Amino acid sequence: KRIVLNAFDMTCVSHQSAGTWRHPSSQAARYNDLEYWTNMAMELERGCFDCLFIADVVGVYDVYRGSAEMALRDADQVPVNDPFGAISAMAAVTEHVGFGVTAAITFEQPYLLARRLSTLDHLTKGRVAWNVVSSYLNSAALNIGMDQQLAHDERYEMADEYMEVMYKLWEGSWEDDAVKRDKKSGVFTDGSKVHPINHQGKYYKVPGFHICEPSPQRTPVIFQAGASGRGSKFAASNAEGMFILTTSVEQARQITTDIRNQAEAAGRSRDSIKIFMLLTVITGDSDEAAEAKYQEYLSYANPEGMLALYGGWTGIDFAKLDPDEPLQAMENDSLRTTLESLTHKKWTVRDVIRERCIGGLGPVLVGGPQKVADELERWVDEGGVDGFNLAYAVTPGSVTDFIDYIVPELRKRGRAQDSYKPGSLRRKLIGTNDGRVESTHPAAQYRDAYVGKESVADRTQPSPFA
């Protein structure tokens, strides 16, 4: 069973690690240079990585110390550029790697997001994934605006209808044989095979038809973050790739068993969702070299940068806490228990935060090729995940080191591909032969669902000019 390898990045400087952009090897500060992204995409194909997963936010981390100042000083997800920006340049110099693009449903109308994602599916020729998020950082709401007549109790009913609209536009609005592109007959599209979706739900009214012709995948690969409670049903119904945060192999066994139970509960197969976990790998020729590289990175750590990120991630303002108390005495159950699973307690909170300047809230794996490859196989086979969203401490070295030191060992163990399967990203990852959604995927119910329903031609009046 092949391990899926993804690079996790974001159009910003400090993503999952604080202060390590200061390292002489890091080009994190080039997030705003086109050459960083095109070099990254080409380097991913040298190692046959499946996908570049680009995160995004539109709010700032202003919880720690009550301001965004510490986040600005260590560039902790600010500044952040639009992750759609460099996709076409990266697709131009690559053939096979996919691009996961994060876009929130909170602020952008579905009709317009549908066109922006369809446009990327055209230009990349079927290599885009949509990471579906619901923005949560508070300054985004304040700076962009949210409609206050919407009950947040109903966010997932809202999110369901949002996706319904997207799936109708992408799958149902144009039939497969609408487009003719026929220079001799002069018919570009047959308007009797284009259909207004006539959507009118509780939250969205979209009467018209999609303004884009069918793209190679139609619906981009759906990526979603793992979630609990009500959000776990939303994720299990729609996700083709699910991005999870797990801190131990033991906890992963339950998370991935639960997700695949929820997939079946939604009418899908246990293997319909590919599960990717956050992981940071520091490696080298030996365990000793990997460890010295780890400590070298940590010497650049900015603990106040990781406290800004923690503040936004958990809501806890560490300026209210005590740096010298031991971890085991931390008040908050949820963070104390996750920090304890992440470290190997009697160390002060200060000592833990410094170590956590690499890895964020995800596990960190340090070792030479054997120890690293061993644990990667343990997460996949024992933990039940399908692969990894590999976060960086330094970039691009984190990806380059993985390719140089780990990929040859994974290939020798038969776990990593040494060439690409042809076709769309969905064909590569999910395996449908046409690169379209599985018939059990909720998008598939709009496929051909407007055949014989109202078309654009149905409204055409006579004309003396005809």
UniProtKB/Swiss-Prot annotation:
Catalytic activity: dimethyl sulfide + NADH + O2 + H(+) = methanethiol + formaldehyde + NAD(+) + H2O
Region described as Disordered: 417-466
Domain of life: Bacteria
Cofactor (UniProt): FMN
Enzyme Commission number(s) from the entry: 1.14.13.131
InterPro entries the record matches: Diverse_substr_monoxygenases, Luciferase-like_dom, Luciferase-like_sf, NTA_MOA
Pfam families assigned: Bac_luciferase (PF00296)
Binding-site residues for FMN, renumbered to this chain: D56, T102, H152, Y156, S228
GO MF annotations, alphabetized: dimethyl sulfide monooxygenase activity
Annotated keywords: Flavoprotein, FMN, Monooxygenase, NAD, Oxidoreductase
Regulation: Inhibited by umbelliferone, 8-anilinonaphthalenesulfonate, a range of metal-chelating agents, and Hg(2+), Cd(2+) and Pb(2+) ions.
Record text on subunit structure and interactions: Heterodimer of 2 subunits, DmoA and DmoB.
Xref: PANTHER family: ALKANESULFONATE MONOOXYGENASE-RELATED, C2H2 FINGER DOMAIN TRANSCRIPTION FACTOR (EUROFUNG)-RELATED
Family: Belongs to the NtaA/SnaA/DszA monooxygenase family.
Other facts noted in the record for this chain: DmoB has not been identified yet. Only a peptide from the protein encoded by a putative flavin reductase (AC E0XCR3) was obtained by mass spectrometry, which is insufficient for linking this gene to DmoB.
Entry function: Monooxygenase that mediates oxidation of dimethyl sulfide, the first step in dimethyl sulfide degradation pathway. Has much lower activity with diethyl sulfide and other short-chain alkyl methyl sulfides.
Official protein name in the record: Dimethyl-sulfide monooxygenase
Species of the source: Hyphomicrobium sulfonivorans
